[PDB]
Design a protein around this ligand. Structure first.
Ligand SMILES: N[C@@H](Cc1cc(I)c(Oc2cc(I)c(O)c(I)c2)c(I)c1)C(=O)O
Ligand SMILES: N[C@@H](Cc1cc(I)c(Oc2cc(I)c(O)c(I)c2)c(I)c1)C(=O)O
Ligand SMILES: N[C@@H](Cc1cc(I)c(Oc2cc(I)c(O)c(I)c2)c(I)c1)C(=O)O
Length: 563
């Protein structure tokens, strides 16, 4: 009778409170912390009245109506959507469209924080959720609850040398948080830009690889439930998403003998740890003597009849059977082969002799398999030779010359993340490299697509990002150097002195040099590799000398006007 009471009872007060704070901070990313805490405490107090009596006034209203009415209580330059003037369901759609993937937003001393922690523990932990959620408005909300548990545990151990304990733990946590956020942003862009059918096919392929002994009916059931979870989370329905994720983990753990031999330990863990464990479980062993793919999908007399009589079941069986046999292929490579198979049946089954028309369809798959295999072989060699920083700089000059209109901060950020694929995947044997590397590159290229959509400047980025979700990686790799680009004239404001540049950490030092290298390539787009190195080495020596001089500002200004 009351949906706010239903979710309060299922989730418990503590997780309900946290999920409503996450929801409000993802919808209004520029609103101060104290204003959101007010609204949350009021929603919670109301929810308790509906638990006491599901029939009290207002207790039958939808969650969208209740939350939106709260948000609407607290310079446009001529352009601003007015979400609070709308009725539901258009009002919720308006809030979703204001989410900002690159918001204009800004860690005290170790002893300071521990002082705040034992002072006001609850307030301390709510500030953590608020700052993550407002910077990452598509973070998977149930996973953010797991990060919060671990963030509390680090303080309730280390505050008891504190900086030698706490700071490495907090570093591993923002590292894994950044990678979690980018992985979920790909699921939401998949569902919203390319549709439910495209997300379902991605899930059929990934779960058939990971659960190869499961029957097709069992994989299809898991795919329907997983699709409902992510549709809710990406549409702002966070209390519903968390409750359905919990139910899916309970189903899997009661049905292990029909799904996978790898789930035992995952399924004995506490509640948030269990779902996190299942999502990252290793692939099960493939059954030994599976019948050939060619017999069911190429040689059978019934191919055209099965495609006409039950199109979605027949093509979903093709994808399940191919994926469970090929854990060594990326997901995007399997989705490419299924699209090629369907296109070939549409043409052949409408003509005279189909059996001979599609008899060689597996020959068309070989160029598609070989192109990614060769790419990853070569970058792992280059990585082994150069190391991560110089591998990054190689990828940065390459991508700047493909799309030089893109902004310098976006080129540095994407290029640094493309180069992390070396440390992440090149240690695996040949066979495990392709899923690791090509599915990671899909996540990083989606980052480039959504950071560029806000302010489009490169027609070639817009085309590669809109044409085909599965073909994005081969589309970017195929771009040649841009010959139409006009060299950027020299500015100088990039290089104004700031005191921090003489006391940089190693990571900060690399980011500055990679920024200078992108600007140099934009200014001199046809200088050679050796010419770029000589200029870069000379400017870095200039910074070195002026950071030692008796008057730093004067040296930078005096020697800078000479350069
Ligand atoms: N000296 C090498 C040439 C080479 C340079 C780069 I830089 C590279 O790295 C990438 C990564 C991605 I992702 C791409 O889309 C592209 I195009 C190149 C690779 I692999 C090879 C050789 O001859 O083998
Ligand atoms: N204007 C910025 C500070 C800033 C100064 C310089 I001078 C600079 O250029 C280099 C070039 C090389 I090559 C280096 O190794 C280094 I370290 C800095 C850059 I990028 C940034 C601010 O106000 O924050
Ligand atoms: N003297 C020229 C202007 C000019 C100034 C600099 I200082 C320079 O050197 C760099 C080094 C890096 I590293 C960059 O990212 C960039 I942009 C320019 C170059 I080549 C040209 C004129 O009067 O027209």
């Amino acid at each position: 009778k009351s949906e706010v009471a239903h979710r309060f009872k299922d989730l418990g007060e503590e997780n309900f409170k946290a999920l409503v704070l996450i929801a409000f901070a993802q919808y209004l990313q520029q609103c101060p912390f104290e204003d959101h805490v007010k609204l949350v405490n009021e929603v919670t107090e109301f929810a308790k009245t509906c638990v006491a009596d599901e029939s009290a006034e207002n207790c039958d209203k939808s969650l969208h109506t209740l939350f939106g009415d709260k948000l609407c209580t607290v310079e446009t330059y001529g352009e601003m959507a007015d979400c609070c003037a709308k009725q539901e369901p258009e009002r919720n759609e308006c809030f979703l469209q204001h989410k900002d993937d690159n918001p204009n937003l800004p860690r005290p001393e170790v002893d300071v924080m521990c002082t705040a922690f034992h002072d006001n523990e609850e307030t301390f932990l709510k500030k953590y959720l608020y700052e993550i959620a407002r910077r990452h408005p598509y973070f998977y909300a149930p996973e953010l609850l797991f990060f919060a548990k671990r963030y509390k545990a680090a303080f309730t151990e280390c505050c008891q040398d504190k900086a030698a304990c706490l700071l490495p733990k907090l570093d591993e946590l923002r590292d894994e948080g950044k990678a979690s956020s980018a992985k979920q942003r790909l699921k939401c862009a998949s569902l919203q830009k390319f549709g439910e059918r495209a997300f379902k096919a991605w899930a059929v392929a990934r779960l058939s690889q990971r659960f190869p002994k499961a029957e097709f009916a069992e994989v299809s059931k898991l795919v329907t439930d997983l699709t409902k979870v992510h549709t809710e989370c990406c549409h702002g329905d966070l209390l519903e998403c968390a409750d359905d994720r919990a139910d899916l983990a309970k189903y899997i753990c009661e049905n292990q003998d029909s799904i996978s031999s790898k789930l035992k330990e995952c399924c004995e863990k506490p509640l948030l740890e269990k779902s996190h464990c299942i999502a990252e479980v290793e692939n099960d062993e493939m059954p030994a003597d599976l019948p050939s793919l060619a017999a069911d999908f190429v040689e059978s007399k019934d191919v055209c009849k099965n495609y006409a009589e039950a199109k979605d079941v027949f093509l979903g069986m093709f994808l399940y059977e191919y994926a469970r046999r090929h854990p060594d292929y990326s997901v995007v490579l399997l989705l490419r082969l299924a699209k090629t198979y369907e296109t070939t049946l549409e043409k052949c089954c409408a003509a005279a002799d189909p059996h001979e028309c599609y008899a060689k369809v597996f020959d068309e798959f070989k160029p598609l398999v070989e192109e990614p295999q060769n790419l990853i072989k070569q970058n792992c060699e280059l990585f082994e030779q150069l190391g991560e920083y110089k591998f990054q700089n190689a990828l940065l000059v390459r991508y700047t010359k493909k799309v030089p209109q893109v902004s310098t901060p976006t080129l540095v950020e994407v290029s640094r993340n493309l180069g992390k694929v070396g440390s992440k995947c090149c240690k695996h044997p040949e066979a495990k490299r392709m899923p690791c590397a090509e599915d990671y590159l899909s996540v990083v290229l989606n980052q480039l697509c959504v950071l560029h959509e806000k302010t489009p400047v490169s027609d070639r980025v817009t085309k590669c990002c809109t044409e085909s979700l599965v073909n994005r990686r081969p589309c970017f790799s195929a771009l040649e150097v841009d010959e139409t680009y006009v060299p950027k004239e020299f500015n100088a404001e990039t290089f104004t002195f700031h005191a921090d540049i003489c006391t940089l950490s190693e990571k900060e030092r690399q980011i500055k040099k990679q920024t200078a290298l992108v600007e140099l390539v934009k200014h001199k787009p046809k200088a050679t590799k050796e010419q770029l190195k000589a200029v870069m080495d000379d400017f870095a020596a200039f910074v070195e000398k002026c950071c030692k001089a008796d008057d730093k500002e004067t040296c930078f200004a005096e020697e800078g006007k000479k350069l």
